[PDB]
Design a binder for these strands. Structure first.
Ligand code: MG
Ligand code: MG
Ligand code: MG
Ligand code: MG
Ligand code: MG
Ligand code: MG
Ligand code: MG
Ligand code: MG
Ligand code: MG
Ligand code: MG
Ligand code: MG
Ligand code: MG
Ligand code: MG
Ligand code: MG
Ligand code: MG
Ligand code: MG
Ligand code: MG
Ligand code: MG
Ligand code: MG
Ligand code: MG
Ligand code: MG
Ligand code: MG
Ligand code: MG
Ligand code: MG
Ligand code: MG
Ligand code: MG
Ligand code: MG
Ligand code: MG
Ligand code: MG
Ligand code: MG
Ligand code: MG
Ligand code: MG
Ligand code: MG
Ligand code: MG
Ligand code: MG
Ligand code: MG
Ligand code: MG
Ligand code: MG
Ligand code: MG
Ligand code: MG
Ligand code: MG
Ligand code: MG
Ligand code: MG
Ligand code: MG
Ligand code: MG
Ligand code: MG
Ligand code: MG
Ligand code: MG
Ligand code: MG
Ligand code: MG
Ligand code: MG
Ligand code: MG
Ligand code: MG
Ligand code: MG
Ligand code: MG
Ligand code: MG
Ligand code: MG
Ligand code: MG
Ligand code: MG
Ligand code: MG
Ligand code: MG
Ligand code: MG
Ligand code: MG
Ligand code: MG
Ligand code: MG
Ligand code: MG
Ligand code: MG
Ligand code: MG
Ligand code: MG
Ligand code: MG
Ligand code: MG
Ligand code: MG
Ligand code: MG
Ligand code: MG
Ligand code: MG
Ligand code: MG
Ligand code: MG
Ligand code: MG
Ligand code: MG
Ligand code: MG
Ligand code: MG
Ligand code: MG
Ligand code: MG
Ligand code: MG
Ligand code: MG
Lengths: 63, 51, 96, 76
RNA sequence: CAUGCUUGAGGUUCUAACUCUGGUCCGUAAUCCGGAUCGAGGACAGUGUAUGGUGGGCAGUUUGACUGGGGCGGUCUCCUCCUAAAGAGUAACGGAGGAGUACGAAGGUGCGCUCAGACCGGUCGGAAAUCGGUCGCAGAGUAUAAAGGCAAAAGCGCGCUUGACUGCGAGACAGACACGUCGAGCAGGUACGAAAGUAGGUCUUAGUGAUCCGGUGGUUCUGUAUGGAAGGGCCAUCGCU
RNA sequence: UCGCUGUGAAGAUGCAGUGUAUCCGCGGCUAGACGGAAAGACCCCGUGAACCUUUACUGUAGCUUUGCACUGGACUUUGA
RNA sequence: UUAAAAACACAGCACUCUGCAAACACGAAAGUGGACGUAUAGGGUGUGACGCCUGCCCGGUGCCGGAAGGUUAAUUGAUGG
RNA sequence: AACCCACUCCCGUUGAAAAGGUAGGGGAUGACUUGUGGAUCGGAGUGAAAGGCUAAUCAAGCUCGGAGAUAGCUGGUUCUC
RNA sequence: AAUGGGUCAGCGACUUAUAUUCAGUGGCAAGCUUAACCGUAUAGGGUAGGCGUAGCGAAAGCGAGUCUUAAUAGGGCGUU
């Protein structure tokens, strides 16, 4: 049958031409005790690491 | 201990800063000037509640 | 996705974004693809007489990618600023 | 026994040795306190980290009173 | 107040619903069952549905790991020193100590100043209070363990102040990942100083908890025929010994 | 298909050195072949299983409270 | 089918429940047992001929009684947004 | 004595026997023994109660299905350079 | 002196289906390829659909650019 994508992996990783996008952690709560620089640098989007691509691509049924 | 408070800008914006204070030693409010990104000046910030 | 019992990536990072339902009926056309319709007119139906777009597409935009062959007339199709200048350059006009 | 505690190591010490080529922003020493002092072309962080503000090579010299050890950047 | 019209609650009473594992007549050759009629109870009891209490009578499960065998005891995250063999890293139920905070000034800046201790002289103190002189060089101090630092003092005092700023960020250190650390410089607005300038918290290294879910403040995003709304997205932020 | 002393996955018929000893039965005895028999029952482990207990967790049969329905008339007390 | 006993039963004793369509038990229910019995009866529990006896505690947990006052479900829907 | 049972020793243990035999032993008019027919059974029955018995099987019978249950655990895995 | 095998003969353990990724080897090529189904039935038709030619952004959207931002500054991703 068709391979089934993992629902939770597709809600956290998006497929682009440069790789797979994702957001950063440690940004949900307990924000007052955090430095502004540290919160500013956890704000954008980052590509997946080289050693984590194989496991995520298998979860997404991309390989 | 130290309780989380919230500083609301005196301008019309909804911008706020967060910090903590000793509400036993210093009961009276904080009146401090901080940069407001929305209006782009330094304005009076007043203490409020975090909840 | 199993890592031995450690919290995995698909549960360690946050969810973000939403899916646009407005983009389901959207398509884009290269300027190099314009010289494949039958005659001198590019419309929503004419791009479906060829096989440029799917039959469920209701909105089409033209982007600058490749040279424009001949003079064509566009019918209710949006174009970028660069794509329009290429179209007007090769005798083609832009109405509707 | 009531002794089995310890903290994780911090990987301190000299990162670039005398004569090595450096670039602006390179970290030279990780420190507690100032075992080495910032010479010409070297800045100091709030945890006493020494970093390069210019390009050149490391020098390492003991000069002045107080017998201090300085790290500076000179043109190759 | 006097009534009228409802309607909450209680008590009494009636018969006509319901109930009778009470009598006698019939179906009938019958201690079942029906129908008829006397007797009794009576809108109660009882059953359906909704709901609170009780309920090992019964059921599906859970009840950590390390460990000089298991159990008992102890430990489980973070910081400092030794072990650790003069770069980094390095184990033991190895040897020793701390943390789960504090501060609107204990932050910034300009200006100004040096401690502990000893001796001599001096009214109640007398070894030690405040004072004057000489020596002293950090044996003091640093919000908090220890180590590394401290004269441009990083120690102490005063005036003004909010840079404990917003958007970033060349380049590095660390590092399985997720995390972490330092930071010149640019743009906006500031604070101290005559100015060069300094300021993106505190002498440094502990003071911490992912995702999911739920709440609050904004938002030129989206919003299931359309205009809105509900809901969702984005930014900020709260709730976990 | 020998003994002894060493060695050796640490208690040797089979390894080393050495000593003994023609080849093959029968009647007896059990010291060894870690002899045969039963994938140890004691002990530990498995994010195994059964059954039992209780003020472990979550439920539930049964028992019980009240609203509505089957369910009506009258009088009286009593609140809006 | 490795335990015949000091284990179980027992007559006697006590507590407690049950007014009859009884309590209780088997049954989705009809019904059946209890019992064609009726508190000198029936069920459950403990003790265990007989003799002399069976002391103190109602704080805990259970059971029984009380009903004033606090909390307290479905239900109802004033008010505000 | 018959009949019902099963306290002791020995034998037997590849047995004559998947629980016997020879010697001794207990009850033997009773809460006795026994023939025929019948009723109750699988989270159920029955039990003078040993967790005993329910066809040489019982801390939940046998049989057929779900079913090739699951097995981070043992065992095995076949020609050549 | 840890497990397994008395011996022989025969049998006895990496498979198949559907979705994919990489490599090798071919057909076409800015295009490639059909599925159900028709059919003269391995031909031929059927290009619905799938992948590619453009990316960035959570999105509206803009597009060789785009996002962040007061910023045409810087930076991320992308482009001959
Ligand atoms: Mg999905
Ligand atoms: Mg956080
Ligand atoms: Mg948020
Ligand atoms: Mg098409
Ligand atoms: Mg220790
Ligand atoms: Mg260590
Ligand atoms: Mg160390
Ligand atoms: Mg600085
Ligand atoms: Mg009856
Ligand atoms: Mg009758
Ligand atoms: Mg009557
Ligand atoms: Mg009633
Ligand atoms: Mg009722
Ligand atoms: Mg009911
Ligand atoms: Mg009812
Ligand atoms: Mg139980
Ligand atoms: Mg249970
Ligand atoms: Mg329970
Ligand atoms: Mg039970
Ligand atoms: Mg289960
Ligand atoms: Mg279990
Ligand atoms: Mg658990
Ligand atoms: Mg263990
Ligand atoms: Mg032990
Ligand atoms: Mg030992
Ligand atoms: Mg323990
Ligand atoms: Mg070292
Ligand atoms: Mg070394
Ligand atoms: Mg090691
Ligand atoms: Mg401790
Ligand atoms: Mg200080
Ligand atoms: Mg020190
Ligand atoms: Mg000086
Ligand atoms: Mg490195
Ligand atoms: Mg000035
Ligand atoms: Mg200036
Ligand atoms: Mg959860
Ligand atoms: Mg609408
Ligand atoms: Mg909205
Ligand atoms: Mg011989
Ligand atoms: Mg030896
Ligand atoms: Mg030997
Ligand atoms: Mg040999
Ligand atoms: Mg030999
Ligand atoms: Mg040899
Ligand atoms: Mg012989
Ligand atoms: Mg013998
Ligand atoms: Mg023998
Ligand atoms: Mg043996
Ligand atoms: Mg086995
Ligand atoms: Mg075994
Ligand atoms: Mg045991
Ligand atoms: Mg466990
Ligand atoms: Mg385990
Ligand atoms: Mg006996
Ligand atoms: Mg016996
Ligand atoms: Mg017995
Ligand atoms: Mg009685
Ligand atoms: Mg007794
Ligand atoms: Mg007795
Ligand atoms: Mg009492
Ligand atoms: Mg009591
Ligand atoms: Mg009472
Ligand atoms: Mg007989
Ligand atoms: Mg005899
Ligand atoms: Mg006999
Ligand atoms: Mg006899
Ligand atoms: Mg007798
Ligand atoms: Mg008989
Ligand atoms: Mg039967
Ligand atoms: Mg069963
Ligand atoms: Mg027992
Ligand atoms: Mg059978
Ligand atoms: Mg049997
Ligand atoms: Mg199955
Ligand atoms: Mg099997
Ligand atoms: Mg084995
Ligand atoms: Mg051998
Ligand atoms: Mg063995
Ligand atoms: Mg073994
Ligand atoms: Mg083997
Ligand atoms: Mg064998
Ligand atoms: Mg090819
Ligand atoms: Mg750019
Ligand atoms: Mg690039």
């Amino acid at each position: 049958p068709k391979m089934k994508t993992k629902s939770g992996a597709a809600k956290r990783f998006k497929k682009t031409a440069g790789g797979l996008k994702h957001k950063h952690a440690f940004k949900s709560h307990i924000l007052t005790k955090m430095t502004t620089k540290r919160k500013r640098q956890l704000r954008g989007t980052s590509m997946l690491n080289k050693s984590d691509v194989a496991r995520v691509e298998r979860s997404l049924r991309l390989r | 201990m130290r309780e989380l408070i919230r500083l609301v800008s005196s301008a019309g914006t909804g911008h706020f800063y967060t910090t903590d204070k000793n509400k036993r030693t210093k009961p009276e409010k904080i009146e401090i000037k901080k940069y407001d990104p929305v209006v782009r000046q330094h304005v009076i910030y007043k203490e409020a509640k975090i909840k | 996705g199993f890592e031995g019992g450690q919290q995995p990536l698909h549960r360690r990072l946050p969810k973000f974004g939403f899916v646009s339902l407005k983009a389901m009926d959207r398509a884009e056309v290269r300027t190099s693809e314009l010289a494949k319709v039958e005659g001198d007119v590019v419309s929503l139906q004419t791009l479906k007489d060829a096989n440029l777009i799917n039959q469920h597409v209701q909105r089409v935009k033209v982007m600058l990618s490749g040279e424009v062959g001949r003079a064509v007339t566009l019918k209710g199709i949006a174009a970028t600023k660069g794509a329009r200048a290429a179209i007007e350059a090769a005798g083609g006009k832009f109405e509707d | 026994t009531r002794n089995g505690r310890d903290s994780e190591s911090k990987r301190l010490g000299v990162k670039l040795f005398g004569g090595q080529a450096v670039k602006a922003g390179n970290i030279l020493v990780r420190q507690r306190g100032t075992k080495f002092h910032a010479g010409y072309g070297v800045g100091l962080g709030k945890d006493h980290t020494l970093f390069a503000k210019v390009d050149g090579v490391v020098k390492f010299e003991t000069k002045g009173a107080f017998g201090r050890k300085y790290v500076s950047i000179v043109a190759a």
